[PDB]
Amino acid sequence: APDIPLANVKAHLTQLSTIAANNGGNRAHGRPGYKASVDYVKAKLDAAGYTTTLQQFTSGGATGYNLIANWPGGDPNKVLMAGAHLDSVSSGAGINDNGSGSAAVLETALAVSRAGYQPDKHLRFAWWGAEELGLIGSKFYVNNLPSADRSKLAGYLNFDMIGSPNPGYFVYDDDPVIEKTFKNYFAGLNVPTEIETERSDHAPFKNVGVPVGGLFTGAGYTKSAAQAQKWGGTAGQAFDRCYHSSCDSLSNINDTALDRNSDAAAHAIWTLSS
Ligand SMILES: N[C@H](Cc1ccccc1)C(=O)O
Ligand SMILES: N[C@H](Cc1ccccc1)C(=O)O
Ligand SMILES: [Ca+2]
Ligand SMILES: [Zn+2]
Ligand SMILES: [Zn+2]
C-alpha cells in the first residue's frame, strides 16, 4: 500500500472546517453543512474516476444522504467496503468525530486512483449520513442492499474517530483476518494496540454477518495510567476532550494518530483486496 500523506488528510479536514463555519457551525443531518460536506467529497472522487452514487433517505422529516463510491473493476462477487460517517452533531464541526475517518477514507480512495491500483476485489467506499441520529444512513444502506449483494461483501472496514487529541490505538476485535491486518501494520511501527471496547456504522453490517473491523482512537472515556505509559498523552483525561463539542475543531486532532491510522487504513484496504 502507499503511505497516505498526512498533509492531504489535514487539507480535507480544513475544507470540512470551513464548510462548518460557512453553514451555521456544524455538518449535521438535515442542515446545509452536511450536504456541502457530501458535495466536497463527491467532487474529489468524481475527479479521480470513481462511479459515485447519492443514496437519499428521510429521517426526522429531513433529507439525508449516503455517498457511495465504486472503483470500477475487480471481482463483482468479492467486494471490499470501507467507510466513515460524514455527519457531525449540531454543536460543532465534528473534525475528529468524524472528519478524521471521513478524510482518511477519502484520501485512501484518492490514493487508489493515484497508484493505478487494480484490486482483485471490487472496492467500494462510503460516507454515511445521520450516524449521530442512530446509525440511520448505514442502517438504510444495509437495509436496502439486496441479500445477493450482501453476500458479495468480503468485509466492511469502519473509521470513526481516528485523530483523537489524547489518543489510544484501538483495533476492533471482530473478524479475525481484518483485525490481524490492522494489528500487523501497528506491529511494524512498534506501536501497541488494544481491543476496542469503548456503536458506529459497522454495526448494521456486522449484524447481518458481513465481516467487519476498524480503527478508533478513543472518545469520552478516560485514558488510564497504563495507556498513557504505552502511548503518551495524559492519564486521567478523556481521549477526546472535545467529543461532541463545539471545540471539535481543527485543533482537536493528534497528527501522529491521524497519520498512523490513515496509513493503517490503506495498508488494510490493499491487503484485504488482493
Ligand atoms: N459512537 C461514535 C463514536 C465511536 C466510534 C467507534 C467506537 C466507539 C465510539 C460517535 O459518537 O460518532
Ligand atoms: N495537531 C496537534 C497540534 C496542534 C494543536 C492545536 C492547534 C494546532 C496544532 C498535534 O498533532 O499535536
Ligand atoms: Ca502517512
Ligand atoms: Zn463518530
Ligand atoms: Zn459522534
- How far does residue 240's CA lie from ligand 2's centre (Å)? 13
Cα 97 vs. chain centroid, distance in angstroms?
A: 9
Q: Total structural domains in the chain? A: 1
Instruction: Name the strand (E) or helix (H) holding 11.
Output: helix 6-22
Identify the nearest ligand to the CA of 264 by its number: 3
Experiment type: X-ray
Residue 99 DSSP label: I
Q: With beta carbons less than 8 A apart as the criterion, state whether 96 and 22 touch.
A: no
Give the domain extent around 255: 1-274
Resolution value, angstrom units:
1.2
Our answer on whether the CB atom of 198 is closer than 6 Å to any ligand 1 atom is yes
- Half-sphere CA count of 38, side-chain side, radius 13 A: 27
Q: With beta carbons less than 8 A apart as the criterion, state whether 161 and 215 touch.
A: no
From the list 83, 99, 107, the residue with the least C-alpha distance to 18 is 99
Considering Cα of 213, then 215, then 218, then 219, what sign does the dihedral take? negative
Q: Rounded CA gap, 69 and 83, in Å?
A: 10
Q: Rounded CA gap, 120 and 46, in Å?
A: 22
From the list 93, 91, 90, 86, the residue with the least C-alpha distance to 66 is 86
Q: Rounded CA gap, 156 and 88, in Å?
A: 21
Q: Which CATH number belongs to the domain containing residue 114 in this structure?
A: 3.40.630.10
From the list 180, 176, 161, 170, the residue with the least C-alpha distance to 240 is 161
- How far does residue 2's CA lie from ligand 2's centre (Å)? 25
Q: Rounded CA gap, 100 and 261, in Å?
A: 9
Burial of 66 per CB tally in 10 Å (0-12, 13-18, 19+): buried
